[PDB]
CSV table of C-alpha atoms and ligand atoms in Angstrom, one decimal:
chain,number,residue,atom,x,y,z
A,1,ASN,CA,44.5,164.5,42.7
A,2,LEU,CA,46.8,167.1,44.2
A,3,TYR,CA,48.2,168.4,40.8
A,4,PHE,CA,47.2,169.6,37.3
A,5,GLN,CA,48.7,170.7,33.9
A,6,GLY,CA,49.2,174.5,34.3
A,7,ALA,CA,48.7,176.9,31.5
A,8,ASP,CA,52.5,176.9,31.0
A,9,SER,CA,54.6,173.7,30.7
A,10,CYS,CA,54.6,172.8,34.4
A,11,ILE,CA,52.8,170.5,36.7
A,12,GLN,CA,51.1,172.7,39.3
A,13,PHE,CA,50.1,171.7,42.9
A,14,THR,CA,46.6,173.0,43.8
A,15,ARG,CA,47.0,173.2,47.6
A,16,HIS,CA,50.8,173.9,47.8
A,17,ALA,CA,50.5,177.7,48.7
A,18,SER,CA,47.9,177.0,51.4
A,19,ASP,CA,50.0,174.0,52.8
A,20,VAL,CA,53.0,176.4,53.0
A,21,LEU,CA,50.9,179.1,54.7
A,22,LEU,CA,49.6,176.6,57.3
A,23,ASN,CA,53.2,175.6,58.2
A,24,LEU,CA,54.2,179.3,58.5
A,25,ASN,CA,51.2,179.7,61.0
A,26,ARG,CA,52.3,176.5,62.9
A,27,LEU,CA,55.9,178.0,63.2
A,28,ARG,CA,54.3,181.3,64.5
A,29,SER,CA,52.1,179.4,67.1
A,30,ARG,CA,55.3,177.7,68.3
A,31,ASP,CA,57.4,180.9,68.1
A,32,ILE,CA,59.9,179.2,65.7
A,33,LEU,CA,62.2,181.5,63.7
A,34,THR,CA,60.0,184.5,64.5
A,35,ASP,CA,62.3,187.6,64.0
A,36,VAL,CA,60.2,190.6,65.1
A,37,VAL,CA,57.8,191.7,67.8
A,38,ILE,CA,55.0,194.1,66.8
A,39,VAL,CA,54.0,196.3,69.8
A,40,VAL,CA,50.3,197.7,69.8
A,41,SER,CA,49.7,199.7,72.9
A,42,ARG,CA,50.1,197.3,75.9
A,43,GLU,CA,50.2,194.2,73.5
A,44,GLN,CA,53.0,192.3,71.8
A,45,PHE,CA,52.7,190.0,68.7
A,46,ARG,CA,55.6,187.8,67.5
A,47,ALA,CA,55.8,187.2,63.7
A,48,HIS,CA,58.0,186.6,60.7
A,49,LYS,CA,59.1,189.8,58.9
A,50,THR,CA,58.7,188.1,55.4
A,51,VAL,CA,55.0,187.2,56.1
A,52,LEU,CA,54.3,190.8,57.3
A,53,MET,CA,56.0,192.4,54.2
A,54,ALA,CA,54.2,189.9,51.9
A,55,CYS,CA,50.8,191.1,53.3
A,56,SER,CA,51.1,194.8,54.0
A,57,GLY,CA,52.3,197.9,52.2
A,58,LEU,CA,53.4,199.4,55.5
A,59,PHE,CA,55.5,196.4,56.6
A,60,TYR,CA,56.9,196.1,53.0
A,61,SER,CA,58.1,199.8,53.3
A,62,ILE,CA,59.6,199.2,56.8
A,63,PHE,CA,61.5,196.0,56.3
A,64,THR,CA,63.0,197.1,52.8
A,65,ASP,CA,64.3,200.3,54.5
A,66,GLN,CA,68.2,199.9,55.1
A,67,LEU,CA,67.9,201.3,58.6
A,68,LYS,CA,64.7,199.6,59.8
A,69,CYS,CA,65.1,196.1,58.1
A,70,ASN,CA,67.3,195.1,61.2
A,71,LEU,CA,64.9,196.2,64.0
A,72,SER,CA,63.7,193.4,66.3
A,73,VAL,CA,60.9,195.6,67.7
A,74,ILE,CA,58.3,197.7,65.7
A,75,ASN,CA,56.0,200.0,67.6
A,76,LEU,CA,52.7,200.8,65.8
A,77,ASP,CA,50.7,204.0,66.2
A,78,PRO,CA,49.2,203.9,69.8
A,79,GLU,CA,45.8,204.6,68.3
A,80,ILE,CA,45.8,201.2,66.6
A,81,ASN,CA,43.3,198.8,68.3
A,82,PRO,CA,45.2,195.6,69.3
A,83,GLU,CA,42.1,193.4,68.6
A,84,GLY,CA,41.9,194.8,65.0
A,85,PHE,CA,45.7,194.1,64.6
A,86,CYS,CA,45.3,190.5,65.9
A,87,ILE,CA,42.4,189.8,63.5
A,88,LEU,CA,44.6,191.1,60.6
A,89,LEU,CA,47.7,189.2,61.7
A,90,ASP,CA,45.6,185.9,61.9
A,91,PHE,CA,44.3,186.8,58.4
A,92,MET,CA,47.8,187.1,57.1
A,93,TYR,CA,48.7,183.6,58.3
A,94,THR,CA,45.4,181.9,57.5
A,95,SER,CA,43.4,183.6,54.6
A,96,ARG,CA,40.5,183.8,57.1
A,97,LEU,CA,39.2,187.3,58.1
A,98,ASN,CA,37.1,187.3,61.3
A,99,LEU,CA,34.9,190.3,60.4
A,100,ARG,CA,32.1,191.0,62.9
A,101,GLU,CA,29.8,194.0,63.6
A,102,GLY,CA,31.7,194.8,66.8
A,103,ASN,CA,35.2,194.8,65.2
A,104,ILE,CA,34.7,195.9,61.5
A,105,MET,CA,35.5,199.6,62.2
A,106,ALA,CA,38.8,198.8,64.1
A,107,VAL,CA,39.7,196.2,61.4
A,108,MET,CA,39.1,198.7,58.6
A,109,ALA,CA,41.1,201.5,60.3
A,110,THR,CA,43.9,199.1,61.0
A,111,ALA,CA,44.0,197.7,57.4
A,112,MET,CA,44.1,201.4,56.2
A,113,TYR,CA,47.2,202.0,58.4
A,114,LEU,CA,48.8,198.8,57.4
A,115,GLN,CA,48.1,199.4,53.7
A,116,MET,CA,46.0,196.2,53.0
A,117,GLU,CA,43.8,197.7,50.2
A,118,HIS,CA,41.6,194.7,49.4
A,119,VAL,CA,40.8,194.2,53.1
A,120,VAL,CA,39.8,198.0,53.3
A,121,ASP,CA,37.6,197.5,50.1
A,122,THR,CA,36.0,194.4,51.7
A,123,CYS,CA,35.2,196.2,55.0
A,124,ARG,CA,33.7,199.1,53.0
A,125,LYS,CA,31.4,196.7,51.1
A,126,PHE,CA,30.2,195.0,54.3
A,127,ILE,CA,29.6,198.5,56.0
A,128,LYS,CA,27.7,199.7,52.9
A,129,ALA,CA,25.3,196.6,53.0
A,130,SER,CA,24.1,197.7,56.6
A,131,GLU,CA,23.6,201.3,55.5
B,1,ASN,CA,35.0,188.2,43.8
B,2,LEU,CA,38.1,187.5,45.9
B,3,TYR,CA,36.3,186.1,49.0
B,4,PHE,CA,33.7,183.6,50.2
B,5,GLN,CA,31.9,182.4,53.3
B,6,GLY,CA,34.1,179.6,54.7
B,7,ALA,CA,32.8,176.5,56.3
B,8,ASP,CA,33.5,178.2,59.7
B,9,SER,CA,32.3,181.7,60.6
B,10,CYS,CA,35.0,183.6,58.6
B,11,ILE,CA,35.2,185.3,55.3
B,12,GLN,CA,38.0,183.5,53.4
B,13,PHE,CA,40.2,185.0,50.6
B,14,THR,CA,40.6,182.5,47.7
B,15,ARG,CA,44.0,183.7,46.3
B,16,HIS,CA,45.6,185.0,49.6
B,17,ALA,CA,48.0,182.0,50.1
B,18,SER,CA,49.2,182.2,46.5
B,19,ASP,CA,49.5,186.0,46.7
B,20,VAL,CA,51.7,185.6,49.9
B,21,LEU,CA,53.8,182.9,48.1
B,22,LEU,CA,54.3,185.1,45.0
B,23,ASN,CA,55.7,187.9,47.3
B,24,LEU,CA,58.0,185.5,49.1
B,25,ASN,CA,59.4,184.5,45.7
B,26,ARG,CA,59.8,188.2,44.7
B,27,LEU,CA,61.7,188.7,48.0
B,28,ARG,CA,63.9,185.7,47.2
B,29,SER,CA,64.6,187.0,43.6
B,30,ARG,CA,65.7,190.3,45.1
B,31,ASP,CA,67.7,188.6,47.9
B,32,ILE,CA,65.5,190.5,50.6
B,33,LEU,CA,65.6,189.0,54.1
B,34,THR,CA,67.1,185.7,52.8
B,35,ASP,CA,68.8,184.1,55.9
B,36,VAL,CA,70.5,181.0,54.6
B,37,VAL,CA,72.6,179.8,51.6
B,38,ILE,CA,72.2,176.1,50.6
B,39,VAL,CA,75.4,174.7,49.0
B,40,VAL,CA,75.0,171.9,46.4
B,41,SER,CA,78.4,170.9,45.1
B,42,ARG,CA,79.8,174.0,43.3
B,43,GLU,CA,76.4,175.8,43.5
B,44,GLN,CA,74.8,178.2,46.0
B,45,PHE,CA,71.1,179.0,46.5
B,46,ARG,CA,69.9,181.8,48.8
B,47,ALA,CA,66.5,181.3,50.5
B,48,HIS,CA,64.3,181.9,53.6
B,49,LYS,CA,64.6,179.2,56.3
B,50,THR,CA,60.8,179.4,57.1
B,51,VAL,CA,59.9,178.6,53.4
B,52,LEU,CA,62.4,175.6,53.3
B,53,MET,CA,61.1,174.2,56.6
B,54,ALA,CA,57.5,174.7,55.4
B,55,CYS,CA,58.3,172.5,52.3
B,56,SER,CA,60.7,169.8,53.5
B,57,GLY,CA,61.0,167.2,56.3
B,58,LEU,CA,64.8,167.6,56.1
B,59,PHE,CA,64.9,171.4,56.4
B,60,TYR,CA,62.2,171.2,59.1
B,61,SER,CA,64.5,168.8,61.1
B,62,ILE,CA,67.6,171.0,60.6
B,63,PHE,CA,66.1,174.4,61.4
B,64,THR,CA,64.2,173.1,64.6
B,65,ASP,CA,67.5,171.7,65.9
B,66,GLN,CA,68.9,174.0,68.7
B,67,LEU,CA,72.4,173.9,67.3
B,68,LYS,CA,71.7,174.1,63.5
B,69,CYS,CA,68.8,176.6,63.5
B,70,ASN,CA,71.4,179.4,63.7
B,71,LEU,CA,73.6,178.3,60.7
B,72,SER,CA,73.9,180.7,57.8
B,73,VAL,CA,75.3,178.0,55.5
B,74,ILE,CA,73.9,174.5,54.9
B,75,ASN,CA,75.9,172.0,52.8
B,76,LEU,CA,73.9,169.2,51.2
B,77,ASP,CA,75.1,165.7,50.3
B,78,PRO,CA,77.7,166.3,47.4
B,79,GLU,CA,75.7,163.6,45.4
B,80,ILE,CA,72.7,165.9,45.1
B,81,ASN,CA,72.2,167.2,41.6
B,82,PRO,CA,72.1,171.0,41.7
B,83,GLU,CA,69.6,171.2,38.8
B,84,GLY,CA,67.2,168.8,40.7
B,85,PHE,CA,67.6,171.0,43.8
B,86,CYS,CA,67.0,174.2,41.8
B,87,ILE,CA,63.7,172.7,40.3
B,88,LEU,CA,62.5,171.8,43.9
B,89,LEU,CA,63.5,175.2,45.3
B,90,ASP,CA,61.5,176.9,42.5
B,91,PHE,CA,58.6,174.5,43.2
B,92,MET,CA,58.7,175.5,47.0
B,93,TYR,CA,58.3,179.2,46.0
B,94,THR,CA,55.9,178.8,43.1
B,95,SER,CA,53.7,175.5,43.4
B,96,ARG,CA,55.0,174.8,39.9
B,97,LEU,CA,57.1,171.6,39.3
B,98,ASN,CA,59.2,171.6,36.1
B,99,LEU,CA,59.3,167.8,35.6
B,100,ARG,CA,60.9,166.6,32.3
B,101,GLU,CA,62.2,163.2,31.0
B,102,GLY,CA,65.8,164.5,31.4
B,103,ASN,CA,65.4,165.7,35.0
B,104,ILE,CA,62.8,163.4,36.6
B,105,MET,CA,65.3,160.9,38.2
B,106,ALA,CA,67.4,163.7,39.8
B,107,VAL,CA,64.2,165.5,40.9
B,108,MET,CA,62.9,162.3,42.5
B,109,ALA,CA,66.3,161.4,44.3
B,110,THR,CA,66.5,165.1,45.6
B,111,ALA,CA,62.9,165.0,46.8
B,112,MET,CA,63.6,161.7,48.7
B,113,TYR,CA,66.7,163.3,50.4
B,114,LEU,CA,64.7,166.5,51.2
B,115,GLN,CA,61.8,164.5,52.5
B,116,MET,CA,59.1,165.9,50.1
B,117,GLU,CA,56.9,162.8,50.0
B,118,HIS,CA,54.1,163.9,47.6
B,119,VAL,CA,56.7,165.1,45.1
B,120,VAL,CA,58.4,161.6,45.3
B,121,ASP,CA,54.9,160.0,44.8
B,122,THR,CA,54.3,162.3,41.8
B,123,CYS,CA,57.7,161.4,40.2
B,124,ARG,CA,56.9,157.7,40.8
B,125,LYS,CA,53.5,157.9,39.0
B,126,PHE,CA,55.1,159.8,36.0
B,127,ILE,CA,57.9,157.2,35.8
B,128,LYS,CA,55.4,154.3,36.0
B,129,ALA,CA,53.4,155.7,33.0
B,130,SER,CA,56.5,155.4,30.7
B,131,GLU,CA,57.2,151.8,31.8
C,201,VGW,C1,49.0,197.3,49.3
C,201,VGW,N1,49.1,195.8,49.5
C,201,VGW,C2,47.9,195.1,49.7
C,201,VGW,O1,46.8,195.7,49.6
C,201,VGW,C3,48.1,193.7,49.8
C,201,VGW,C4,49.3,193.1,49.9
C,201,VGW,N2,49.5,191.8,50.1
C,201,VGW,C5,48.4,190.7,50.0
C,201,VGW,C6,49.1,189.4,50.0
C,201,VGW,C7,47.5,190.9,51.2
C,201,VGW,C8,47.7,190.8,48.7
C,201,VGW,N3,48.3,191.1,47.6
C,201,VGW,C9,47.6,191.2,46.5
C,201,VGW,C10,46.2,191.1,46.5
C,201,VGW,C11,45.4,191.3,45.2
C,201,VGW,C12,44.8,190.1,44.5
C,201,VGW,C13,45.9,190.8,43.9
C,201,VGW,C14,45.6,190.8,47.7
C,201,VGW,N4,46.3,190.7,48.8
C,201,VGW,C15,50.5,193.9,49.7
C,201,VGW,C16,51.8,193.3,49.7
C,201,VGW,C17,52.9,194.1,49.6
C,201,VGW,N5,54.1,193.5,49.5
C,201,VGW,C18,54.9,193.4,48.4
C,201,VGW,C19,54.5,194.0,47.2
C,201,VGW,C20,55.3,193.8,46.0
C,201,VGW,N6,56.4,193.2,46.0
C,201,VGW,C21,56.8,192.6,47.1
C,201,VGW,CL1,58.3,191.7,47.0
C,201,VGW,C22,56.1,192.6,48.3
C,201,VGW,C23,56.6,192.0,49.5
C,201,VGW,N7,57.0,191.4,50.4
C,201,VGW,C24,52.8,195.4,49.4
C,201,VGW,C25,51.5,196.0,49.4
C,201,VGW,C26,50.4,195.2,49.6
C,202,VGW,C1,57.4,165.3,54.6
C,202,VGW,N1,56.9,166.6,54.2
C,202,VGW,C2,56.3,166.7,52.9
C,202,VGW,O1,56.3,165.7,52.2
C,202,VGW,C3,55.8,168.0,52.5
C,202,VGW,C4,55.9,169.1,53.3
C,202,VGW,N2,55.5,170.3,53.0
C,202,VGW,C5,54.7,170.7,51.8
C,202,VGW,C6,54.2,172.1,51.9
C,202,VGW,C7,55.5,170.5,50.6
C,202,VGW,C8,53.4,169.8,51.8
C,202,VGW,N3,52.8,169.6,53.0
C,202,VGW,C9,51.7,168.8,52.9
C,202,VGW,C10,51.3,168.2,51.7
C,202,VGW,C11,50.1,167.3,51.7
C,202,VGW,C12,48.8,167.7,51.1
C,202,VGW,C13,48.9,167.5,52.6
C,202,VGW,C14,52.0,168.5,50.6
C,202,VGW,N4,53.1,169.3,50.6
C,202,VGW,C15,56.5,169.0,54.6
C,202,VGW,C16,56.6,170.0,55.5
C,202,VGW,C17,57.2,169.9,56.8
C,202,VGW,N5,57.2,171.0,57.6
C,202,VGW,C18,56.4,171.0,58.8
C,202,VGW,C19,55.6,170.0,59.2
C,202,VGW,C20,54.8,170.1,60.3
C,202,VGW,N6,54.8,171.2,61.0
C,202,VGW,C21,55.5,172.2,60.7
C,202,VGW,CL1,55.5,173.6,61.7
C,202,VGW,C22,56.4,172.2,59.6
C,202,VGW,C23,57.2,173.3,59.2
C,202,VGW,N7,57.8,174.3,58.9
C,202,VGW,C24,57.6,168.6,57.1
C,202,VGW,C25,57.6,167.6,56.3
C,202,VGW,C26,57.0,167.7,55.0
């Protein structure tokens, strides 16, 4: 069964939000309706502004700004590690966070900059377990 | 706990896809970055093309078409019931389907037109239980 009786009146579909997110990632893979390029040092990442805003306090601030909402190109701080950004962008579109000993510091610093609080909190807990 | 060890290597966040979908619905409520208006008889519905394509075989066909991907206005068949469309648009953004005796036929006919197969299948099962 794909549905249940929600707490409210409605029929609710268990996997709907993840099925939507999978299609948004498929659109991203195929570069369909992507409307922004995020530049991180020498690297470029195409994405959908709505997904970025939905996942980050920094992108939410940028794309709700009357002047910046219309930008096609966004340059991040040149100190941002592109691999850390790539891991977080994949997480936004998949719910899967590829945290490893060799990338955890860059992922945490990037999530702090992008304002993804629960990812920062998660990185902190994994770091504390090895200390 | 908000995360777990997925079947693959990654840490996976349980509520991430639904937290993304909630923010996409908040953006829609506030008319932020909406890029299309769907016209259903005398009624207009503002939405995000990526969400519509992610949820419907008809919108996926339209917005991947080289000519139609750029349209700001999409007119649906004038025989489509606006309430049925509204219930399905809310479902796309919430995972919640407000199926009632008084709207089930219009919801089913609209889901057939929009190519939302599992919603059609769900309507059919609820209809069959009252027959
Ligand atoms: C700071 N922060 C985060 O740590 C995480 C954000 N998003 C994700 C999806 C990663 C998220 N949200 C909630 C939760 C916890 C379980 C409840 C976890 N993960 C987030 C999203 C917006 N974005 C918006 C905020 C409010 N209203 C709107 Cl319309 C938007 C948008 N778009 C802002 C700031 C944000
Ligand atoms: C016909 N049909 C549907 O019944 C339902 C669609 N989407 C939702 C989210 C409502 C959905 N998907 C899967 C499932 C079942 C559990 C597995 C349930 N509900 C759907 C989405 C696309 N959209 C795409 C299809 C393929 N690849 C891409 Cl990139 C897109 C997009 N965008 C097409 C046709 C579709």
